Amino acid sequence: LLKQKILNRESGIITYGITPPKKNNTEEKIKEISQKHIERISGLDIDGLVIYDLQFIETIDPQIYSENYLKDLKIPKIIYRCVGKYTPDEFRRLTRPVSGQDAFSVFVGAASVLLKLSDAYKIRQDVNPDLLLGGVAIPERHMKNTDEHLRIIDKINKGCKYFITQAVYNVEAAKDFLSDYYYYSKNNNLKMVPIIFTLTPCGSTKTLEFMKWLGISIPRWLENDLMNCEDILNKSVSLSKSIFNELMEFCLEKGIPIGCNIESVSVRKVEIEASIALAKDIKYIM
Amino acid sequence: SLLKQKILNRESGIITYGITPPKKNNTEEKIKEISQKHIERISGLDIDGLVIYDLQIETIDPQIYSENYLKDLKIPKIIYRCVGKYTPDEFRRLTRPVSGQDAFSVFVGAAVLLKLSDAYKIRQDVNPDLLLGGVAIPERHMKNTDEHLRIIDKINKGCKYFITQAVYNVEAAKDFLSDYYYYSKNNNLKMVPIIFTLTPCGSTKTLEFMKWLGISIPRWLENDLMNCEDILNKSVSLSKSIFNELMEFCLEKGIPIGCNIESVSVRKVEIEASIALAKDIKYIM
Ligand SMILES: CN1c2c(nc(N)[nH]c2=O)NC[C@@H]1CNc1ccc(C(=O)N[C@@H](CCC(=O)O)C(=O)O)cc1
Numbered sequence: 001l002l003k004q005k006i007l008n009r010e011s012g013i014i015t016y017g018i019t020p021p022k023k024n025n026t027e028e029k030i031k032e033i034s035q036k037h038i039e040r041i042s043g044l045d046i047d048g049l050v051i052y053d054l055q056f057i058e059t060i061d062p063q064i065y066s067e068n069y070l071k072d073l074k075i076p077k078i079i080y081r082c083v084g085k086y087t088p089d090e091f092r093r094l095t096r097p098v099s100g101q102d103a104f105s106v107f108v109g110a111a112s113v114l115l116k117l118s119d120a121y122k123i124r125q126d127v128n129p130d131l132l133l134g135g136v137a138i139p140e141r142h143m144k145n146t147d148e149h150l151r152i153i154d155k156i157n158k159g160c161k162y163f164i165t166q167a168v169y170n171v172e173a174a175k176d177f178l179s180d181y182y183y184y185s186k187n188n189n190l191k192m193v194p195i196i197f198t199l200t201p202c203g204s205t206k207t208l209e210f211m212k213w214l215g216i217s218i219p220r221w222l223e224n225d226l227m228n229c230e231d232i233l234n235k236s237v238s239l240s241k242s243i244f245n246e247l248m249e250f251c252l253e254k255g256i257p258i259g260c261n262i263e264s265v266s267v268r269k270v271e272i273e274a275s276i277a278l279a280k281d282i283k284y285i286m
Numbered sequence: 287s288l289l290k291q292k293i294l295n296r297e298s299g300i301i302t303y304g305i306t307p308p309k310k311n312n313t314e315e316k317i318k319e320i321s322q323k324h325i326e327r328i329s330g331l332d333i334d335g336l337v338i339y340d341l342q343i344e345t346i347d348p349q350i351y352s353e354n355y356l357k358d359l360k361i362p363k364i365i366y367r368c369v370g371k372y373t374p375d376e377f378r379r380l381t382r383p384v385s386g387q388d389a390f391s392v393f394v395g396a397a398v399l400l401k402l403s404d405a406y407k408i409r410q411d412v413n414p415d416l417l418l419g420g421v422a423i424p425e426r427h428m429k430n431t432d433e434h435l436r437i438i439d440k441i442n443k444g445c446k447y448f449i450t451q452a453v454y455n456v457e458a459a460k461d462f463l464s465d466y467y468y469y470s471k472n473n474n475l476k477m478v479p480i481i482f483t484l485t486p487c488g489s490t491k492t493l494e495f496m497k498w499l500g501i502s503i504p505r506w507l508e509n510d511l512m513n514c515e516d517i518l519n520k521s522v523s524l525s526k527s528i529f530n531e532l533m534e535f536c537l538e539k540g541i542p543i544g545c546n547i548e549s550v551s552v553r554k555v556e557i558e559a560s561i562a563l564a565k566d567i568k569y570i571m
Pocket residue numbers: 018019052053054080082107108109110111112117135136166167214215265
């Protein structure tokens with residue numbers, strides 16, 4: 001389902017996204033956390049499950065978390081790799097094809113390293129041409145030099161067949177990126193790959209500082225409301241939905257294949273329950 | 287008539303008929319008679335467009351022929367230009383758009399007053415809405431296997447379709463199509479319509495002209511001709527067979543394919559064979 005959507009460059013891809021727990025936790029806490037992820041996510045209708053990688057918070061390896069903890073979830077997993085964490089020989093090994101299974105992955109370069117991103121892309125070309133590779137796109141970064149479309153075209157050239165954005169909190173940056181992506185592709189006679197927009201609810205100052213650490217900002221107006229002790233969680237979701245709806249419209253008009261990834265980044269029941277509900281609402285919309 | 291939409295929609299099924307304007311030396315009444323015969327036969331065709339060749343013998347200018355003798359034919363005209371015969375300034379003048387009217391042109395380089403690369407830049411500057419096509423030569427693919435790259439590069443410079451020279455070798459054409467398809471698939475490119483030219487050959491006179499244009503027929507075919515056999519039908523039959531094979535290959539891979547039936551002969555029998563073939567190809571596609 002997911003593999004085909006991606007190979008045929010279709011709209012409508014929908015994924016949910018989680019970060020594995022800390023390594024620190026007892027072996028029993030993990031299985032509980034893990035069984036909770038399984039119960040709620042198995043209740044969705046998604047094409048795949050993104051599992052993030054971070055580069056004090058050291059989380060379970062995304063692929064190990066996938067295989068050894070989440071096998072009961074019968075959907076593909078998109079395994080993120082902060083390649084700079086891996087020596088080039090670890091990276092060759094992790095990228096090897098395994099007989100009788102597909103593989104989905106997003107290679108993430110340095111936010112600011114034992115292995116550079118250009119090198120990781122060629123290591124993949126060497127060892128597993130069939131790995132369904134995605135790239136990270138950052139619409140906010142397009143405001144600074146109007147070349148994030150060019151950055152993702154260079155990633156397409158390097159093997160990428162889809163892009164998953166960080167959390168989108170600004171519709172104009174996102175439409176500006178989509179625009180320059182559409183027009184450049186058209187002018188250079190290119191086909192387009194799926195642009196998967198991530199939505200990430202934010203319901204506490206705790207969630208927010210994790211988000212800032214990931215490089216995600218929310219609007220100053222919204223943060224202001226949080227620092228002045230209002231509940232922003234529902235305004236998160238409403239603003240996120242608003243944004244995605246406008247992007248889905250912009251994308252229909254121009255035939256840009258668009259997907260959505262609903263990211264759950266909080267340790268709080270209420271916020272996690274908001275993510276799950278957002279993931280259901282998004283399916284309904286598209 | 288649907289021609290622009292088929293081009294812009296990258297559709298299969300473009301069919302055109304192809305003529306070279308008569309010699310410049312014939313008289314205004316004789317050009318009018320030649321032109322009346324053309325309009326008579328070609329108006330009996332269901333085609334998308336009439337290709338009008340430019341030679342780099344001296345023949346009436348194709349745009350001038352189209353506009354002042356072929357008004358009666360209600361179909362778009364694809365104006366060939368051997369850019370090398372025109373100065374950079376005269377080319378600007380001819381490229382300029384005409385109000386409420388689509389322009390179609392194939393720019394041909396040298397086998398010169400203007401380089402082809404500069405002719406493309408002139409189109410970019412003076413008329414971006416000119417529906418521009420390129421010559422593709424499958425036979426030449428067998429030299430270095432890079433004709434597909436030649437055309438990709440022409441697409442980059444503004445071409446939106448390709449009209450090959452007369453096809454007589456199905457394997458070279460299929461090799462060119464194959465590499466075009468696969469290179470397009472792997473570098474994320476859309477494909478543009480490849481219009482294959484079929485050109486009946488009925489006499490040594492037709493052949494010497496075709497040879498001068500850079501076209502060859504198969505040795506076995508030319509052998510029968512030089513041994514005084516009528517090859518007109520054989521050349522048509524072969525042309526049809528090649529195109530059926532190319533259509534099948536193209537349909538399987540989703541490659542947009544068209545056909546241009548070229549008449550290149552002064553002999554009535556060869557001209558009627560070309561008309562017939564045009565109607566045959568339409569039926570086939
Ligand atoms: C998307 N990220 C992310 C996550 N985990 C969660 N939960 N959420 C996230 O958004 N883990 C990986 C990354 C963490 N943050 C970031 C943010 C930006 C870049 C970044 O600028 N990436 C460029 C690299 C530039 C380079 O060195 O070439 C890239 O294209 O990958 C990397 C990591």
